[PDB]
């Protein structure tokens, strides 16, 4: 158990637990400090830390010590005894809060027992030397009047009050002759500058801190966690493992980059959480090795130590025993000390990954920042930590009895205001970057708001070095984690060995290196005329001395006029916001513009499913103009084209080393070692893959995700500014009225602000998801594949290497040299799948990942789309696409393959996308229109199979071919074994849904089946378990190839590939998404047009058509003629028959050229009678359920309705549409729908039934039934002449 001593600042000196100490950095001169022993080996000195600081530095000046801290100054802190005593009592409570839990008590116990080795690098191995400034510190025994008697003592930790900057807590170790004992295994006296009342403030952007913009957002820190954070550094320092290694260093070549001090891996380990992942596994191991090496040096000293000259009273055994336990060395029955790998490993992990701020915060239920790389904010002052009404040893601020326990409400700035006070900005110092334009207006930006981007130098190149594979060689992995529960329950973790006496001989060699600090300018100017994020956000603010503003979509005016504020919301929203109204209409207006705000903010949930993009926040580009001029042009389009990478302010130069070559150890005649060797090189190869991935994740987190975090923050600020601006306008407008008018104006600013705030929170969530999705997208498509390339390159080089090896030893491999020849190939075969959770256990990151991977659209490895008269791949994987001259394309994303040699498309697929699941698992989807066979060429049509899409590599692959009325899918495994599945549509039907008609195809493949889907429905299946490997990433060729007729062609649209098997659900869903359009379709499936001749088809009367009756102004219904010629293979009904209709537009007399017919349009339905154009009418006064339509010349009789509204009642994809007659555009009185009705006719000679072109009210209720009755006689389709259909 740990004992926390008690005392008052005025208690008298006793030279034991209360002394006059001579601090290490005083170099043995200067005055002493009243020091209090709070526990063994730990001292508290309630005075300001002055070593290395000028006295005036304690005042706020025009400078700053650290560029990334809102520094608070106060030279009066601790300038009295009562203050010093308060400081003491406060420290006592914090230490008490700390040991209040097992985890904290152990940290304290580990620290107390982690006494520094007696000596350092300069000391001889056979000796213990206490006479160095990292081991002994002196205390003055003498009477106040002389330094006559000084005594030396051993100490582990000395804690002072803060230096010039109150909120800049720090742990310092002792350097002597340019070396640090605490960094080389010995350990040494640790010091700390600490301030308990002025704690840091932080807030999680992805989360809602009270979810109120008009209120204080954020959380303040539990000073006990802050202290435990520093105590972790102390623990590292004491055990001598606070080693230096390759640091994370920020790139600063660009003005938008954040400037900050280099960050050592130890710093990130201390914080824990995601941060350790920024330290590559490479460096992780480098550090592990350095520490191990340091321990080897100590264990060797223990086996050599003989005497201690410095203190003749030191008991060598007592210390050898203590140090043995400290470092967990093992001693044989003979007394020989040696390093035990298990014990070391566990001890190392415990100190670097067990004791972390993250793990501790979690155990003590204390809330803290998300990552070391989180924007710092202005600190707040806790009112009184000594008041149990506000802060307790057991719960800190989150006191349950006060209901401040849930959701860390006790640390919530908006909820626990009685706990703290805001700080006088007048005393805060903040490093700023002043961006001036070469002219000239200037903008100040906090160095915090810039983009932190790790320079390439931050990462290890170790992967590029050679490796020696020997029968004994083994893998190397360091899990950046540690089971906190076992750490807490570890029985032998805490020493049970006697702590030696702290009294020793006085220190006489005061040699030590003292740091010297100095401020630097708090403002750094830079010149740039760039109008990126910083400017855009700026243009959205206004001066405090200005209260009358106006919104404007002009970024340039906003900058030029203080009364002008930029808004990235809609033109309409902007106009309404600047409107001015009568007091009596003000309330209406307030409700209107506020609701409008929420609408605009909510556009953050926009979907773009047709472009295979689920979520997109359209206004991000206008709001920040971040990355590549994202404020110009249409953002959504730009995004569809280049994706996530267009949002980045800078594209990072990744470090992807060529994996060092392997060197295997040969063992002549030894059939065992030779094999081991081989096996090992294999395993090692896998370690190389993992290490490479970690290297990637590390760079992604510190150069990419960091930028995206900056963007999410920028959006939060942008949205906040918009609300503030609107609020400003509202207040201004309202205050223009008289008190009398105001009294009668019903307005509740609390509901307004609540409305805004809510709309913002919704938008923030959408924005956060969109951005995380982008980040993960960039990782997986722009980073990972490049690592895969070099990793596969490595594999190959290793492949021959291994073979050539087995080769040379085949002798000593005799009758087994074979069983391993394959063993090698079959290993370097199946590669390693990337798994984020392997390099981190951060909940947020893991979830981002799983979310991404659970979105089918991300399984798209090829998506050919039309753009600026050209087909490009928008999968994001960069496939190269060559579209040759003979290929015709349109902006309808339709492309045509002809019989010409140059009607061809070549796709060079990305070779670095994992596509070899090792069982075949992928899908292909596309729309197609296959022309009808030539009646005189039917034999060749059914006989000649021709390839349309071929993807082969080494006589293995897949292909789509066609033989007449049959489309075929074929696979060839590496052995030449083939399998196919096909879909054949019937060519003997009166009317076909497929011939010359656009239809959706989808082919799925999995270890067991090959399935063909047509329009969302499954049509064919083939068992493919037999098929072996199938190379599928070879070149893809789109071209007709086979004995085809010269007139043969094929139309294709939306060709795409997924590296997985699509479910019936996904397929049905893709069918619907791609079928959608505002416009109606024609019989063939192309968009319906105005001023285009069409024959009419009836879905309810397939073999019926319309003809003008000879003696009557009506349309009679005749039976379609059918295929005349003979042949046992074909049969169909003629389509180019009946009257030739033409759809005419209604409003806008902008001539009658042409255009697209959209659902709900009003039209005239005409047809050609000889040289004239007639029209279809309805007698307004028919009284029966149905009426025969009136067909006559164009005129405007008041007895006939002539206006028709085209409709779509079917909610599922269809080429049918319906025609409605309504009183007039306005009226909601539906006269009826156009269809066909049966009539009984009995003349003097003939007696029969005869169908007519009618209008009918019966259809009105029928079209509402579900499912939609496709057979309804009111379902029509328009057939225009098409080269794909001849009769
Ligand atoms: Ca790591
Ligand atoms: Ca302005
Ligand atoms: Zn730290």
C-alpha 640/C-alpha 616 separation (Å) is 10
Query: How far is the centre of ligand 1, averaged over its atoms, from the C-alpha of 1208 (Å)?
Result: 59
HEC letters along 597-650: HHHHHHHHHCCEHHHCECCCCCCHHHHHCCCCCCCCCCHHHHHHHHHHHHCCCC
List Cα–Cα distances, 916 to 389, 689, 712, 911, 978, in angstroms. Answer: 63, 17, 36, 11, 18
Catalytically annotated residue among 22, 71, 168, 230: 230
Same domain, yes or no: 566 and 459:
yes
Query: How far is the centre of ligand 3, averaged over its atoms, from the C-alpha of 171 (Å)?
Result: 8
Ligand nearest 285 Cα, by number? 1
Q: In what order do the strands lie in the sheet with 442-446?
A: 442-446, 432-436, 523-527
Q: Please state whether 852 falls in left (phi above 0), alpha (psi between -120 and 50) or beta.
A: alpha
Tokens describing residue 182: 């605490």
Q: Is 1096 exposed, middle or buried (0-12, 13-18, 19+ CB in 10 A)?
A: buried
Q: What is the CATH number of the domain that holds 1154?
A: 2.80.10.50
- Confirm whether residue 427 is marked as ligand binding: no
> Is 127 considered catalytic here?
no
> CA angle 541-547-549, nearest 5°?
60
Give yes or no for a contact between 1266 and 1066, defined as CB atoms under 8 angstroms apart: no
Strands 523-527 and 432-436: parallel
Tokens describing residue 165: 């900057």
H helices of 515-554, in order, are 533-538
Among the three residues 803, 827, 851, which one is the final residue of a domain in this structure? Answer: 827
Measured from the Cβ of residue 1089, the count of other Cβ atoms closer than 10 Å reads 19
C-alpha 4/C-alpha 6 separation (Å) is 7
Query: How far is the centre of ligand 3, averaged over its atoms, from the C-alpha of 229 (Å)?
Result: 6
C-alpha 839/C-alpha 846 separation (Å) is 10
- Confirm whether residue 1021 is marked as ligand binding: yes
Same domain, yes or no: 300 and 413:
yes
Give yes or no for a contact between 1105 and 1240, defined as CB atoms under 8 angstroms apart: no
For 260-295, b/e burial (b = at least 16 CB within 10 A) is beebbbbbbbbbbbbbbbbbbbbbbbbbbebbbebb
- Confirm whether residue 1185 is marked as ligand binding: yes
C-alpha 393/C-alpha 223 separation (Å) is 11
List Cα–Cα distances, 45 to 167, 952, 1114, in angstroms. Answer: 17, 77, 108
Q: Residue 1224 falls within a domain, yes or no?
A: yes
Cβ neighbours of residue 538 closer than 8 Å, sequence gap 6 or more: 443, 559
Q: Residue 591 falls within a domain, yes or no?
A: yes
Q: What is the CATH number of the domain that holds 901?
A: 2.60.120.200
Reported for 798-801, long-range contacts at CB under 8 A and 24+ positions apart, including other chains, are 798/662, 798/681, 798/685, 798/828, 799/824, 799/825, 799/828, 801/661, 801/662, 801/664
Q: Residue 228 falls within a domain, yes or no?
A: yes
Give yes or no for a contact between 130 and 120, defined as CB atoms under 8 angstroms apart: no
Ligand nearest 541 Cα, by number? 2
Give yes or no for a contact between 617 and 607, defined as CB atoms under 8 angstroms apart: no
Q: What range defines the domain where residue 1144 resides?
A: 1089-1279
C-alpha 8/C-alpha 11 separation (Å) is 5
Same domain, yes or no: 627 and 763:
yes
Q: Widest CA span of the chain, in angstroms?
A: 147
CA proximity to 684, closest of 828, 805, 804: 828
C-alpha 966/C-alpha 980 separation (Å) is 12
Q: What is the CATH number of the domain that holds 739?
A: 1.20.1120.10
Q: Please state whether 920 falls in left (phi above 0), alpha (psi between -120 and 50) or beta.
A: left
Reported for 1013-1019, long-range contacts at CB under 8 A and 24+ positions apart, including other chains, are 1013/1064, 1013/1067, 1014/983, 1015/1071, 1015/1213, 1016/1064, 1016/1067, 1016/1068, 1016/1071, 1016/1072, 1018/1064, 1019/983
- Confirm whether residue 479 is marked as ligand binding: no
* Residue 203 three-state SS: coil
* Residue 525 three-state SS: strand
Give yes or no for a contact between 191 and 171, defined as CB atoms under 8 angstroms apart: yes
- Confirm whether residue 1236 is marked as ligand binding: yes
C-alpha 683/C-alpha 687 separation (Å) is 6
Strands 1204-1207 and 1200-1201: unpaired
For the chain, state the CA radius of gyration: 40
First and final C-alpha spacing in the chain: 99
Strands 1036-1041 and 966-972: unpaired
Query: How far is the centre of ligand 1, averaged over its atoms, from the C-alpha of 257 (Å)?
Result: 24
- Total domains in the fold of the chain: 4
Q: What is the number of alpha carbons within 13 Å of residue 1021 lying toward its C-beta? A: 8
Q: State the structure-solving technique.
A: X-ray
Helix (H) or strand (E) holding 983: strand 978-984
Given resolution (angstroms): 2.2
- Please spell the DSSP secondary structure of 443-485, one letter per residue: EEEEGGGSB--B-GGGS--GGGS-EEE-TT-------S---HH
Q: In what order do the strands lie in the sheet with 957-963?
A: 880-883, 905-908, 1036-1041, 945-952, 957-963, 966-972, 978-984
The DSSP 8-state label assigned to residue 372 in this structure reads: S
- Report the DSSP beta bridge partners of residue 1145: 1163
Strands 157-160 and 42-45: parallel
The DSSP 8-state label assigned to residue 1199 in this structure reads: T
Q: Residue 741 falls within a domain, yes or no?
A: yes
Q: What is the CATH number of the domain that holds 174?
A: 3.90.1240.10
- Please spell the DSSP secondary structure of 14-32, one letter per residue: -SSSEEEEE-GGGTT-S--
C-alpha 594/C-alpha 747 separation (Å) is 12
Same domain, yes or no: 1262 and 1196:
yes
Cβ neighbours of residue 947 closer than 8 Å, sequence gap 6 or more: 959, 960, 961, 1039, 1040, 1041, 1042
HEC letters along 577-604: HHCCCCHHHHHHHHHHHHHHHHHHHHHH
C-alpha 897/C-alpha 862 separation (Å) is 19
Q: Please state whether 497 falls in left (phi above 0), alpha (psi between -120 and 50) or beta.
A: beta
Sign of CA dihedral 742, 745, 748, 749: negative
Q: Residue 1163 falls within a domain, yes or no?
A: yes
Among the three residues 827, 861, 889, which one is the final residue of a domain in this structure? Answer: 827
Tokens describing residue 204: 């999680």
- Confirm whether residue 750 is marked as ligand binding: no
- Confirm whether residue 1186 is marked as ligand binding: yes
C-alpha 497/C-alpha 325 separation (Å) is 7
Same domain, yes or no: 920 and 850:
yes
> CA angle 934-938-941, nearest 5°?
90
C-alpha 4/C-alpha 383 separation (Å) is 24
Same domain, yes or no: 448 and 330:
no
Helix, strand, coil share of the chain (percent; to 5): 30, 25, 45
Q: Residue 878 falls within a domain, yes or no?
A: yes
Q: Residue 69 falls within a domain, yes or no?
A: yes
Ligand nearest 459 Cα, by number? 1
CA proximity to 1205, closest of 1181, 1178, 1233: 1233
Same domain, yes or no: 431 and 456:
no
CA proximity to 364, closest of 197, 224, 199: 224
CA proximity to 504, closest of 769, 115, 169: 115
Measured from the Cβ of residue 216, the count of other Cβ atoms closer than 10 Å reads 16
Query: How far is the centre of ligand 1, averaged over its atoms, from the C-alpha of 269 (Å)?
Result: 8
Query: How far is the centre of ligand 3, averaged over its atoms, from the C-alpha of 788 (Å)?
Result: 35
Give yes or no for a contact between 1087 and 1077, defined as CB atoms under 8 angstroms apart: yes
> CA angle 1202-1205-1206, nearest 5°?
130
* Cis check: omega of the bond before 1267, within 30 degrees of 0: yes
For 463-475, b/e burial (b = at least 16 CB within 10 A) is beeebebbbebee
The residue with tokens 């310092």 is 172
Among the three residues 1017, 1046, 1075, which one is the final residue of a domain in this structure? Answer: 1075
Ligand nearest 697 Cα, by number? 1
Ligand nearest 372 Cα, by number? 3
Same domain, yes or no: 365 and 323:
yes
Same domain, yes or no: 97 and 126:
yes
Tokens describing residue 100: 């209040």
C-alpha 262/C-alpha 702 separation (Å) is 13
Cβ neighbours of residue 1133 closer than 8 Å, sequence gap 6 or more: 990, 991, 1102, 1103, 1120, 1121, 1122, 1123
> CA angle 556-561-566, nearest 5°?
55
C-alpha 169/C-alpha 194 separation (Å) is 5
Give yes or no for a contact between 1138 and 1095, defined as CB atoms under 8 angstroms apart: yes
Give yes or no for a contact between 682 and 824, defined as CB atoms under 8 angstroms apart: yes
For helices 749-778 and 843-853, give the axis angle rounded to 10 degrees.
70
The residue with tokens 């116990």 is 109
Q: What is the number of alpha carbons within 13 Å of residue 336 lying toward its C-beta? A: 3
C-alpha 76/C-alpha 50 separation (Å) is 13
Same domain, yes or no: 1148 and 1031:
no
Query: How far is the centre of ligand 1, averaged over its atoms, from the C-alpha of 660 (Å)?
Result: 21
For helices 583-601 and 571-578, give the axis angle rounded to 10 degrees.
160
Q: Is 789 exposed, middle or buried (0-12, 13-18, 19+ CB in 10 A)?
A: middle
Cβ neighbours of residue 1219 closer than 8 Å, sequence gap 6 or more: 1165, 1204, 1205, 1206, 1207, 1233, 1234, 1274, 1276
List Cα–Cα distances, 611 to 860, 873, 924, 1074, in angstroms. Answer: 12, 12, 16, 9
- Please spell the DSSP secondary structure of 1223-1234, one letter per residue: SSSS---EEEEE
CA proximity to 1218, closest of 1199, 1197, 1232: 1232
Q: Residue 1129 falls within a domain, yes or no?
A: yes
Query: How far is the centre of ligand 3, averaged over its atoms, from the C-alpha of 187 (Å)?
Result: 18
Same domain, yes or no: 1055 and 1155:
no
Query: How far is the centre of ligand 2, averaged over its atoms, from the C-alpha of 751 (Å)?
Result: 28
Give yes or no for a contact between 1132 and 1122, defined as CB atoms under 8 angstroms apart: yes
CA proximity to 836, closest of 767, 775, 791: 775
CA proximity to 1083, closest of 1072, 1070, 1071, 1092: 1092
Please report the beta strands in 1027-1171, taking only residues with DSSP state E, as ranges in sequence order: 1036-1041, 1050-1058, 1089-1090, 1093-1098, 1104-1108, 1115-1119, 1141-1145, 1155-1156, 1162-1169
C-alpha 339/C-alpha 331 separation (Å) is 9
Query: How far is the centre of ligand 1, averaged over its atoms, from the C-alpha of 304 (Å)?
Result: 36
Cβ neighbours of residue 850 closer than 8 Å, sequence gap 6 or more: none
Give yes or no for a contact between 608 and 614, defined as CB atoms under 8 angstroms apart: yes
List Cα–Cα distances, 122 to 125, 127, 186, 506, in angstroms. Answer: 9, 11, 11, 19
CA proximity to 1287, closest of 1093, 1066, 1169, 1135: 1135
Same domain, yes or no: 705 and 771:
yes
H helices of 738-783, in order, are 739-743, 749-778
> Residues with Cβ within 5 Å of ion ligand 1?
276, 279, 284, 480
Count of residues making up the chain = 1287
Q: Is 507 exposed, middle or buried (0-12, 13-18, 19+ CB in 10 A)?
A: buried
Ligand nearest 693 Cα, by number? 1
């Amino acid at each position: 158990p740990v004992t926390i001593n008690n005392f008052n600042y005025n208690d008298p000196i006793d030279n034991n637990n209360i002394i006059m100490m001579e601090p290490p950095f005083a170099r043995g001169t200067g005055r002493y400090y009243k020091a209090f022993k709070i526990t063994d080996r730990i001292w508290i000195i309630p005075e300001r830390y002055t070593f290395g600081y000028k006295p005036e530095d304690f005042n706020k000046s025009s400078g700053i010590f650290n560029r990334d801290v809102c520094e608070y100054y106060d030279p009066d802190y601790l300038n009295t005894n009562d203050k010093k005593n308060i400081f003491l009592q406060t420290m006592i409570k914090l230490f008490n809060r700390i040991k209040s839990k097992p985890l904290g008590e152990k940290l304290l116990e580990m620290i107390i027992n982690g006494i520094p080795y007696l000596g350092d690098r300069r000391v001889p191995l056979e000796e213990f030397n206490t006479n160095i400034a990292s081991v002994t510190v002196n205390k003055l025994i003498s009477n106040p009047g002389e330094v006559e008697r000084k005594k030396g003592i051993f100490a582990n930790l000395i804690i002072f009050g803060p230096g010039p900057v109150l909120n800049e807590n720090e742990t310092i170790d002792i350097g002597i002759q340019n070396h640090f004992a605490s960094r080389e295994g010995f350990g040494g006296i640790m010091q700390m500058k600490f301030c308990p009342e002025y704690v840091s403030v932080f807030n999680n952007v992805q989360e809602n801190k009270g979810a109120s913009i008009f209120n204080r957002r954020g959380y303040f820190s539990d000073p006990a966690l802050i202290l435990m954070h520093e105590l972790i550094h102390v623990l590292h320092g004491l055990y001598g493992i606070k080693v230096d290694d390759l640091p994370i260093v920020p790139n600063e070549k660009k003005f938008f980059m954040q400037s900050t001090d280099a960050i050592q891996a130890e710093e990130l380990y201390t914080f824990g959480g995601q941060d350790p992942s920024i330290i590559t596994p490479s460096t992780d191991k480098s550090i592990y090795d350095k520490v191990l090496q340091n321990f080897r040096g100590i264990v060797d000293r223990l086996n050599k130590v003989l005497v201690c000259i410095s203190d003749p009273n030191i008991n060598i055994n007592i210390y050898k025993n203590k140090f043995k336990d400290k470092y967990k060395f093992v001693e044989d029955s003979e007394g020989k000390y040696s390093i035990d790998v298990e014990s070391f490993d566990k001890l190392y992990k415990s100190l670097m990954f067990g004791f972390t701020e993250t793990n501790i915060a979690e155990n003590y239920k204390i809330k803290t920042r998300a990552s070391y790389f989180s924007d710092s904010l202005p600190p707040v002052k806790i009112k009184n930590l000594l008041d149990n009404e506000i802060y307790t040893i057991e719960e800190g601020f989150n006191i349950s009895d006060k209901d401040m326990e849930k959701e860390y409400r006790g640390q919530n700035k908006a909820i626990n205001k009685q706990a703290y006070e805001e700080i006088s900005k007048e005393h805060l110092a903040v490093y700023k970057i002043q961006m001036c334009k070469s002219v000239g207006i200037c903008i100040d930006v906090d160095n915090e708001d810039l983009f932190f981007i790790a320079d390439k130098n931050s990462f290890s190149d170790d992967l590029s070095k050679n490796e020696r594979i020997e029968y004994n060689t083994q893998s190397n992995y360091i899990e950046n984690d540690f089971p906190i529960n076992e750490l807490i329950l570890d029985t032998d973790l805490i020493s049970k060995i006697e702590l030696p006496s702290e009294n020793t001989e006085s220190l006489t060699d005061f040699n030590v290196d003292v740091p010297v600090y100095e401020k630097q300018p708090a403002i750094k100017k830079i010149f740039t005329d760039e109008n990126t994020i910083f400017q855009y956000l700026y243009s959205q603010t206004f001066p405090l001395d200005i209260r009358d503003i106006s919104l404007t979509s002009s970024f340039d005016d906003a900058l030029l006029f203080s009364n002008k504020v930029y808004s990235f919301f809609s033109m309409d929203y902007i106009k309404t916001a600047n409107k001015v109204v009568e007091a009596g209409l003000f309330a209406g207006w307030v409700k209107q513009i506020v609701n409008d705000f929420v609408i605009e903010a909510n556009k953050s949930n926009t979907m773009d499913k047709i472009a295979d993009i689920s979520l997109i926040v359209p206004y991000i580009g206008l709001a920040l103009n971040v990355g590549n001029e994202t404020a110009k042009g249409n953002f959504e389009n730009a995004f569809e084209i280049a994706g996530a990478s267009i949002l980045l302010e800078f594209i990072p130069e990744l470090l992807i080393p060529v994996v060092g070559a392997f060197l295997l150890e040969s063992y002549i005649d030894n059939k065992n070692k030779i094999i081991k060797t081989i096996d090992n090189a294999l395993t090692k190869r896998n370690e190389k893959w993992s290490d490479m991935y970690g290297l990637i994740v590390a760079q992604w987190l510190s150069t990419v995700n960091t930028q995206f975090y900056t963007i999410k923050e920028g959006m939060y600020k942008a949205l906040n500014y918009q609300a503030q601006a609107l609020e400003e306008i509202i207040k201004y407008r309202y205050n223009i009225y008289s008190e009398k008018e105001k009294s009668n104006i019903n307005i509740d600013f609390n509901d307004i602000n609540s409305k805004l705030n809510e709309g913002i929170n919704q938008a923030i969530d959408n924005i956060n998801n969109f951005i995380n999705g982008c980040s993960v997208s960039y990782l997986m498509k722009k980073m990972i594949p490049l690592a895969v390339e070099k990793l596969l390159d490595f594999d190959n080089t290793l492949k021959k290497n291994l073979l050539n090896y087995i080769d040379e030893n085949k002798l000593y491999l005799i009758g087994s040299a074979e069983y391993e020849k394959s063993k090698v190939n079959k290993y370097l075969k199946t590669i390693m799948p990337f798994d984020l959770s392997i390099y981190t256990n951060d909940t947020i990151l893991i979830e981002m990942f799983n979310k991404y991977n659970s979105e089918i659209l991300n399984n798209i490895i090829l998506n050919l789309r039309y753009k600026d008269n050209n087909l490009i791949d928008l999968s994001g994987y960069g496939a190269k696409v060559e579209v040759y001259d003979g290929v015709e394309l349109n902006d309808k994303n339709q492309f045509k393959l002809t019989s010409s040699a140059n009607s061809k498309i070549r796709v060079t697929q990305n070779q670095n996308i994992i596509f070899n699941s090792v069982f075949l698992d992928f899908s292909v989807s596309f729309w197609i229109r296959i022309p009808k066979y030539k009646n005189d060429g039917i034999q060749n049509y059914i006989h000649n199979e021709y390839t349309i899409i071929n993807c082969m590599k080494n006589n293995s692959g897949w292909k789509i071919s066609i033989r007449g009325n049959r489309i075929i899918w074929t696979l060839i495994d590496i052995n030449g074994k083939t399998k196919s599945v096909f879909f054949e549509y019937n060519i003997r039907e009166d009317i076909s849904e497929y011939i010359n008609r656009w239809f959706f195809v989808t082919i799925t493949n999995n270890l067991n089946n090959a399935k063909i889907y047509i329009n969302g429905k499954l049509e064919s299946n083939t068992d493919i378990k037999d098929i072996r490997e199938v190379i599928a990433n070879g070149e893809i060729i789109f071209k007709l190839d086979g004995d085809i007729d010269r007139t043969q062609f094929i139309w294709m649209k939306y060709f795409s590939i997924f590296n997985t098997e699509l479910s019936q659900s996904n397929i049905e869903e893709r069918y619907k998404i791609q079928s959608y359009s505002e416009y109606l379709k024609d019989f063939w499936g192309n968009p319906l047009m105005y001023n285009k001749e069409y024959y009419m088809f009836n879905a309810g009367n397939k073999n019926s058509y319309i003809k003008l009756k000879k003696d009557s102004p009506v349309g009679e219904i005749l039976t379609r003629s059918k295929y005349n010629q003979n042949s046992k293979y074909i049969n169909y009904r003629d389509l180019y028959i009946g009257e030739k209709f033409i759809i005419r537009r209604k409003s806008n007399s902008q001539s009658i050229n042409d255009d697209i017919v959209r659902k709900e349009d009003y039209i005239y339905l005409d047809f050609f009678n000889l040289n004239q154009e007639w029209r279809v009418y309805t007698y307004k006064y028919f009284k029966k359920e149905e009426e025969k339509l009136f067909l006559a010349p164009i005129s405007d009789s008041d007895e006939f309705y002539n206006t028709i509204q085209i409709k779509e009642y079917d909610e599922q994809p269809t080429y049918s549409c319906q025609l409605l007659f309504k009183k007039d555009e306005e009226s909601t009185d539906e006269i009826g729908l156009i269809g066909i009705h049966r009539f009984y006719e009995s003349g003097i000679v003939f007696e029969e039934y005869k169908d007519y072109f009618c209008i009918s009210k019966w259809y009105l209720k029928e079209v509402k039934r579900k499912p939609y009755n496709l057979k309804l006689g009111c379902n029509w389709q328009f057939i225009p002449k098409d080269e794909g259909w001849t009769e």
